[PDB]
C-alpha cells in the first residue's frame, strides 16, 4: 500500500524535525560573539601552473603537500610539482570527458573518470618508466562524479546513477554499495580517519555513510538545489556543503543538523567547490562567477577573495600542511595561493 507508507514517512519526517528543533538551543553567531573577526585575508598567487589546453574539472593534493594532480577535458591528467611548476607526468586519457581525480595517500596512484562511468586507477612508479592504467573500475550505470582512495587497494566513488560504492582495486569488484540518494551524487569526502564519509547529491541532501557497515547513518537537509561539493571538517564531527542554491552550509554530525549558512543575497550563482583551512577558521568556496570567497567559518562573514581566473573556479584544495590553497579553473590554469 503506497498510502500507508507515504503517511508513515510524513509522520517520521515531522518527528525528526521536532526532535531537531528541540535541540537547536543556540546559534553559532551567539556562541562566537566574543570572538573577533579574522583579518582581511589577502592571499597571493605564488604559482600559475600552465599546460592544460581546456577546462580543468578537478584536482587533488598529494599528502606530501607538494605534488598535485589535475584533470582536464583536453585529455590529460597532469601531476605537477607545485614547488617548481615542472610537470612530473602528463598522462593521456582514453576518455576526455573527465569529471574527477584523486591522489592516493601513498603517492603511488591517481584515479580519474567521468562520463565513461569508469574509475580508472593509474600506477605511478612502475617497472620501467611508463605510467599505465592498472585497473578500470566498472559497475556504475552513470557518470563518475568523485572518487577518493582510502589506501592503495580501496577507493570510494560517487555517481550520477544515485549511488556510491567502495571498491577493491586488486579484484576490481564493488565490495560495498551505498544506496539511498534519490538523485545524482555529485561529491563525497572521507572523514580524517576514513571509517565514515559524506556524500552530496541532486536530491539537495547530504548523507553520512559507515564504510564498514555499508549504510546511511544520517541524512542532512536544508539546501534548495544540488549539492555540488562537500568537505569534512578536520576534527571529523562536522562537514561543509556547496550548492547551486548559492549557499555553503556547515553541518554537525552529533547535532544531526545545520549550524551555519554562508551566503550573500547579492551572490545567486552556484558553488563548485569547498575546502576548510587547516584549523577550520576559514571555509574557501569557488563560484560560477570566476571568484573564490574566503569565509570566516566562525563568524559567517566573507574575510577575503581569490580573484585571478578568467572563467569559473571549478575545483579547489588546501594542502595537508595548510601552507597553500590550489584553485583550478575553466580558463585552463591552476593557481597556488597563500
Amino acid at each position: 500500500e503506497l498510502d500507508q507508507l507515504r503517511q508513515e514517512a510524513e509522520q517520521l519526517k515531522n518527528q525528526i524535525r521536532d526532535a531537531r528543533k528541540a535541540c537547536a538551543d543556540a546559534t553559532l553567531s551567539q556562541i562566537t560573539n566574543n570572538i573577533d573577526p579574522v583579518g582581511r585575508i589577502q592571499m597571493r598567487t605564488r604559482r600559475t601552473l600552465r599546460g592544460h589546453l581546456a577546462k580543468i574539472y578537478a584536482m587533488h593534493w598529494g599528502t606530501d603537500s607538494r605534488l598535485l594532480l589535475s584533470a582536464s577535458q583536453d585529455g590529460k591528467l597532469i601531476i605537477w610539482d607545485s614547488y617548481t611548476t615542472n610537470k612530473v607526468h602528463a598522462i593521456p586519457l582514453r576518455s576526455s570527458w573527465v569529471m574527477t581525480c584523486a591522489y592516493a595517500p601513498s603517492g603511488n596512484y591517481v584515479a580519474c573518470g567521468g562520463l565513461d562511468n569508469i574509475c580508472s586507477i593509474y600506477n605511478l612508479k612502475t617497472r620501467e618508466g611508463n605510467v599505465r592504467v592498472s585497473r578500470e573500475l566498472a559497475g556504475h550505470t552513470g557518470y563518475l562524479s568523485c572518487c577518493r582512495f582510502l589506501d592503495d587497494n580501496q577507493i570510494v566513488t560517487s555517481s550520477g546513477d544515485t549511488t556510491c560504492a567502495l571498491w577493491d582495486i586488486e579484484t576490481g569488484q564493488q565490495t560495498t554499495t551505498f544506496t539511498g540518494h534519490t538523485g545524482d551524487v555529485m561529491s563525497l569526502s572521507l572523514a580524517p580517519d576514513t571509517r565514515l564519509f559524506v556524500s552530496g547529491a541532486c536530491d539537495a541532501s547530504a548523507k553520512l555513510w559507515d564504510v564498514r557497515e555499508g549504510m546511511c547513518r544520517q541524512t542532512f537537509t536544508g539546501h534548495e538545489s544540488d549539492i555540488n561539493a562537500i568537505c569534512f571538517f578536520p576534527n571529523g564531527n562536522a562537514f561543509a556543503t556547496g550548492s547551486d542554491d548559492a549557499t555553503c552550509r556547515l553541518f554537525d554530525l552529533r547535532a544531526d543538523q545545520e549550524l551555519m549558512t554562508y551566503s550573500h543575497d547579492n551572490i545567486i550563482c552556484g558553488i563548485t567547490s569547498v575546502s576548510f583551512s587547516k584549523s577550520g577558521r576559514l571555509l574557501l568556496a569557488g563560484y560560477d562567477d570566476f571568484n573564490c570567497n574566503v569565509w570566516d567559518a566562525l563568524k559567517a562573514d566573507r574575510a577575503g577573495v581569490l580573484a585571478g581566473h578568467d572563467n569559473r573556479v571549478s575545483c579547489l584544495g588546501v594542502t595537508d600542511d595548510g601552507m597553500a590553497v590550489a584553485t583550478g579553473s575553466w580558463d585552463s590554469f591552476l593557481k597556488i595561493w597563500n
Epitope: 574539472y57 577535458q73 576518455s95 570527458w97 569529471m99 567521468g114 562520463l115 565513461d116 562511468n117 550505470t141 552513470g142 557518470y143 562524479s145 550520477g160 545524482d184 555529485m186 561529491s187 541532486c202 544540488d226 555540488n228 547551486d244 552556484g270 563548485t272
Partner: nanobody, 114 residues
Framework: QVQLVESGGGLVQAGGSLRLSCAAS????????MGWYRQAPGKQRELVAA???????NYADSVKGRFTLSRDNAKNTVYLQMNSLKPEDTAVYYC????????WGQGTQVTVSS
C-alpha cells in the same frame, strides 16, 4: 579533446517551431542521462527537458506537450523539438551531461516574437 555542439536556434514567430540539436564528439548519450536547460535575460537557469539513459523523458510544466526530447545514439545527437512557441520561451538553451559537475554547450539563443 571533446565537443558538445548545439545548433538550431534563432528567431521565430510566436506559435512557430525550432529543432535544437546537440551533437557530442563521442558516445556519451548512450550511457548517461542528459538535460536541456534554459536561461532567459536576468533569470536563473532552469531544467526544461531531461532524458534518462534508458529513454524516459521528463519536462518542466511550462513546456509539457509542446517540447519533445528525442535521441539518436548512432550519431551521438539529441534533439529538442519545440513546437507552438511563446514569448516566455525566449532564452539561451544549453545542452548538458553530468549536471553542474559536467559538460555544457556554449548556449543557443532562441527568440520568440509577437
Amino acid at each position: 579533446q571533446v565537443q558538445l555542439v548545439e545548433s538550431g536556434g534563432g528567431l521565430v514567430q510566436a506559435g512557430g517551431s525550432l529543432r535544437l540539436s546537440c551533437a557530442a564528439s563521442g558516445s556519451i548519450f548512450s550511457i548517461n542521462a542528459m538535460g536541456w536547460y534554459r536561461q532567459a535575460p536576468g533569470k536563473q537557469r532552469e531544467l526544461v527537458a531531461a532524458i534518462t539513459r534508458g529513454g524516459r523523458t521528463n519536462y518542466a510544466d511550462s513546456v509539457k506537450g509542446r517540447f519533445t526530447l528525442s535521441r539518436d545514439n548512432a550519431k551521438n545527437t539529441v534533439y529538442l523539438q519545440m513546437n507552438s512557441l511563446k514569448p516566455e520561451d525566449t532564452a539561451v538553451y544549453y545542452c548538458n551531461v553530468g549536471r553542474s559537475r559536467g559538460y555544457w554547450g556554449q548556449g543557443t539563443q532562441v527568440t520568440v516574437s509577437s
